Design a protein around this nucleic acid. Structure first.
Ligand SMILES: Cc1cc(/C=C/C#N)cc(C)c1Nc1ccnc(Nc2ccc(C#N)cc2)n1
Lengths: 412, 533
DNA sequence: TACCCCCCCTTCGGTGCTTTGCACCGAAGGGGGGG
């Protein structure tokens, strides 16, 4: 056989030569066995010492399974080939997927295992398996078939994907099919039984064409921006009014209509924090007006596909995290909360990792553009443990905030 | 006609550019040696092909200009195998593979780019040259390709090529080692290579990269101890470097006070007068350095453990072992990460470093043994805003244990005196007014000198703490002081923060509240008016 | 006198908020073991 679509980088930019982080011994044995199995099948071929390019490689797992999966960091090759899979061969994104009822995610990775890659482009997709203690030089390989994790593979394979899924789209105009990497999102307004039946029908339809497949659905209806509410108290001391004034001063940027004129008249003197101060009628009216402002949606916050998405994350203790997706700060495109899944205090890197995987999936569903994370974590700790609990075929872009946030104004 | 049992690795050149245009004992025998090379198939004559120019041992040709012309290769090895991660071997022989460098055929088309026509005669390389940038990588990949079947049939044999040799290690005795050496000789000679060695064969311990490698132990080269009465800055730098190198097998090496002497002077000649603490640490280090200590090699059938100890003034030591008192490695961590920090953060950074280095060296994670109670770690991490995780570990009773010296309050203390603090300053005149006001009526403002808003506020809290009781509530207006004190520091780069911390040690209960200023809430307006002039 | 590979310590420039100081980081010098 089939035509190999010519793939070429932007002139004036070299390929990937970044190094690889050290790997655990088990994550090396599994990687070697997987690479040998793929070598016996012709998917990858050994490369000599004439290739100077390299990309990082890791070994991850999947829920309810015991076999490892090989993951390749293509964050630099994707940035270099952006033109191929964005402008010339982009993928349309529906504007009404977030308004659907249930979105189910399926894996279509093996679809890229049956298409050869460009002859000139085979050298850029080279990876290396290191060894323990740097004793014996790592085993190098390059991809023959289309690569998993490279964002250009959907661009090349959409031509065949359209022919595969055209009958299914024709028989069911009521559902929306979107593709992002090896992830296939099917959005339907049906019920649980109907959705599962349609999923089985789609699975057998894929099996008709030969797609190797050996609670998956999301619920966008429950995805609503968390509203900020002040806490009502039976007794209002000086410290409580002080905290309320501080929170309102912080939130005045988010909502310009917040006023603290009457709430300041109750603290003119120098009173002890413990002593209780009653509430006047003017202060009560202003507080009610502020709550009325708080119970409305944001004003002037418009999404912009041209800019880039940025995701703040804050730890609130007791296993709670608060996330904010926005393109310009103090102007929230989305705000939400997240809680753990099990345990009293089991893990914290695991919680942050799967929270990242949750918000990034939500942002892909809603807009399709991956937010740039700003993780409250040490660079060394994250890079050491970002993979042990990470279960995804693709990797976002993050930075680190070594800066102490003092905002406890999201969790009650 | 040449011969090549191994396939030739293709070599390209950088696009858009072409190839550019002696010895002492052998200056007239070069003709004879070139004829010998031609006779033994290494060299073949050429004709008028391309205008080039090139410049007991043998003549070596420099490829300095051509090195920047050949394509870029792969850095086959980048790190050095630390001896702790190695394995115990009962036999370690060395074979001479110096003459095999010219036995690796070059590419068919690249031979035309390597021509040494300077005597004019015709002469071009048909094999891997010496000094070429691409030659070592190609040679050491061909060696791996050749030796793959041998390692696949003999898995316990370990082969390392350091320079012009091949070190082969096995766990069999010498009598059975000779048979394996003969088998390897035949296997490597089927490609046309002989490896006779006499010089360094069976001569342990090898002095490799600065380590003496005994068959079952490893150590570092003896550390020279300077003993000059007066030390220049360069002598101190050499001493701290040698101590850092020696700390990998010698536990207890501290260099903080010695390294502190290098600040303030930049020239390389002055003799800085010593200090008592630096001399004490130097004597302490020399106490360990008198008796040499060696480690043991890693065993894959047993788990490994890593202990952590504290030495005071912000420095920790660690020993990674597999059997008690049989260490695998030792090390020290004394880096200052941030101006204000406590010892629990230092412990976290330390265990991070041990985990990372054990992943690099052993590929696993060791079970830690820390001098901290589980309750302290929980109370710190569950309340800290950052994210962190410590792998499987245990607690060992070993002073000085790490603990939080003081803790703050979440709710205001009932019946406790409430101080209001603030601080005003001018960026131009370096003037300062930092005082406190109490609800009961006590107002105390003191002139300042050479202070900045953050410092004025910090010492305003200092004044509030100076004259108060055990139960105190304090109200401030700066997020800088809130961040510093909520971080719960046990050390700092300034004396003011140290004094504040010392004040926090004595008080039984402390409350700190921040409310915005320049907004007319509470006594902030009153104290700002008081400190304005 | 080059030019590299890994480690430690001090220094400085930039960067971002905590906002004209101060904290944090990664690149440079010096040192150590070497090619
Ligand atoms: C890195 C390495 C350096 C030298 C260094 C060569 C030189 N000069 C020699 C050898 C054989 C190796 N390779 C390996 C591989 C696995 N375990 C070991 N352990 C091991 C190390 C030294 C001795 C000894 N004597 C015995 C066993 N060495």
């Amino acid at each position: 056989p089939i035509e190999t679509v010519p793939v070429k980088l932007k002139p004036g930019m070299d390929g990937p030569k970044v190094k690889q982080w050290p790997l655990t011994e088990e994550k090396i044995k599994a990687l070697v066995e997987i690479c040998t199995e793929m070598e016996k099948e012709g998917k990858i071929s050994k490369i000599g010492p004439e290739n100077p390019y390299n990309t990082p490689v890791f070994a991850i797992k999947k829920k309810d399974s015991t076999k490892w999966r090989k993951l390749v960091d293509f964050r630099e090759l994707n940035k270099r080939t952006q033109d191929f899979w964005e402008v010339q061969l982009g993928i349309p994104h529906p504007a009404g997927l977030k308004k659907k009822k249930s979105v189910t995610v399926l894996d279509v990775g093996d679809a890229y295992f049956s298409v050869p890659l460009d002859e000139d482009f085979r050298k850029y997709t080279a990876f290396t398996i290191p060894s323990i203690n740097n004793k014996t030089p790592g085993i190098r390989y390059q991809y023959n078939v289309l690569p998993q994790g490279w964002k250009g593979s959907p661009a090349i394979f959409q031509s065949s994907m359209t022919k595969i899924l055209e009958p299914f789209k024709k028989q069911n105009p009521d559902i929306v099919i979107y593709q992002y990497m090896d992830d296939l999102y099917v959005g339907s307004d049906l019920e649980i039984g109907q959705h599962r039946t349609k999923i089985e029908e789609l699975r057998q339809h894929l099996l008709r064409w030969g797609l190797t497949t050996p609670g998956y659905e999301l619920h966008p209806d429950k995805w609503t921006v968390q509203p900020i509410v002040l806490p009502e108290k039976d007794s209002w001391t000086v410290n409580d009014i002080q905290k309320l004034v501080g929170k309102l001063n912080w939130a005045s940027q988010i909502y310009p209509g917040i006023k603290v004129r009457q709430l300041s008249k109750l603290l003119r003197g120098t009173k002890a924090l413990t002593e209780v101060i009653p509430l006047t009628e003017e202060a009560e009216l202003e507080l009610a007006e502020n709550r009325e402002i708080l119970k409305e949606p944001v004003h002037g916050v418009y999404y912009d596909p041209s800019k880039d998405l940025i995701a703040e994350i804050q730890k609130q203790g007791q296993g709670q995290w608060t996330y904010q997706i926005y393109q310009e700060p103090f102007k929230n495109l989305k705000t939400g909360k997240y809680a753990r899944m099990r345990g009293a205090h089991t893990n914290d890197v695991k919680q942050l990792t799967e929270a990242v995987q949750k918000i990034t999936t939500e942002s892909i569903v809603i807009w399709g553009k991956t937010p740039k994370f700003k993780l409250p974590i040490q660079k060394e700790t994250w890079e050491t443990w970002w993979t042990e609990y990470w279960q995804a075929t693709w990797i976002p872009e993050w930075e680190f905030v070594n800066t102490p946030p003092l905002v406890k104004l999201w969790y009650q | 006609v040449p011969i090549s049992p191994i396939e030739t690795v293709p070599v390209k050149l950088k696009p858009g550019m072409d190839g550019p245009k002696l010895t002492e004992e052998k200056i007239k025998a070069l003709v004879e040696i070139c004829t010998e090379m031609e006779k033994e198939g290494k060299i073949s004559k050429i004709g008028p092909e391309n205008p080039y120019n090139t410049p007991k041992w043998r003549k070596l040709v420099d490829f300095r200009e051509l090195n920047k012309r050949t394509q870029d290769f792969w850095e086959v090895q980048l790190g050095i195998p630390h001896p702790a991660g190695l394995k115990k071997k009962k036999s370690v022989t060395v074979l001479d593979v110096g003459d095999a460098y010219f036995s690796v055929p070059l590419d068919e088309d690249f031979r035309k780019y390597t021509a040494f026509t300077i005597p004019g005669i015709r002469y071009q390389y048909n094999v891997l040259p010496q000094g070429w940038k691409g030659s070592p990588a190609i040679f050491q990949s061909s060696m791996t390709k050749i030796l793959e079947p041998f390692k696949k049939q003999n898995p316990d044999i370990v082969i390392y090529q350091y320079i012009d040799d091949l070190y082969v290690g096995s766990d069999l005795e010498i009598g059975q080692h000779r048979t394996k050496i003969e088998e390897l000789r035949q296997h490597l000679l089927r490609w046309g290579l002989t490896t006779p060695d006499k010089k360094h064969q069976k001569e342990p311990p090898f002095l490799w990269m600065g380590y003496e490698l005994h068959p079952d132990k490893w150590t570092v080269q003896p550390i020279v101890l300077p003993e000059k009465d007066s030390w220049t800055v360069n002598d101190i730098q050499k001493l701290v470097g040698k101590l850092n190198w020696a700390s990998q097998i010698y536990p207890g090496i501290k260099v903080r006070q010695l390294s502190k002497l290098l600040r303030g002077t930049k020239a390389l000649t002055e003799v800085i007068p010593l200090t008592e603490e630096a001399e004490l640490e130097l004597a302490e280090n020399r106490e360990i350095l008198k008796e040499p200590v060696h480690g043991v090699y890693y065993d894959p059938s047993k788990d490994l453990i890593a202990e952590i100890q504290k030495q005071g003034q912000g420095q920790w030591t660690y020993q990674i072992y597999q059997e008690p008192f049989k260490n695998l490695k030792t090390g020290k961590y004394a880096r200052m990460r941030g101006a204000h920090t406590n010892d629990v953060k230092q412990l976290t950074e330390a265990v991070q470093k041990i985990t990372t280095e054990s992943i690099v060296i052993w590929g696993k994670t060791p079970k830690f043994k820390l001098p901290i109670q589980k309750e302290t770690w929980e109370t710190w991490w569950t309340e800290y805003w950052q994210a962190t995780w410590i792998p499987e570990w245990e607690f060992v009773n070993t002073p000085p244990l790490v603990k939080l010296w003081y803790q703050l309050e979440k709710e205001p203390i009932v019946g406790a005196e409430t101080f209001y603090v603030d601080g005003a300053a001018n960026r131009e005149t370096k003037l300062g007014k930092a005082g406190y006001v109490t609800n009961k009526g006590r107002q105390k403002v003191v002139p300042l000198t050479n202070t900045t808003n953050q410092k004025t506020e910090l010492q305003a809290i200092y004044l509030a703490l100076q004259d108060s009781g055990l139960e105190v509530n304090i109200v401030t207006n700066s997020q800088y002081a809130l961040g510093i004190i909520q971080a719960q520091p046990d050390k700092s780069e300034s004396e003011l923060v140290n004094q504040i911390i010392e004040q926090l040690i004595k008080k039984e209960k402390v409350y700190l509240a921040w409310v915005p200023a320049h907004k007319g809430i509470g006594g902030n307006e009153q104290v700002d008016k008081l400190v304005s002039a």
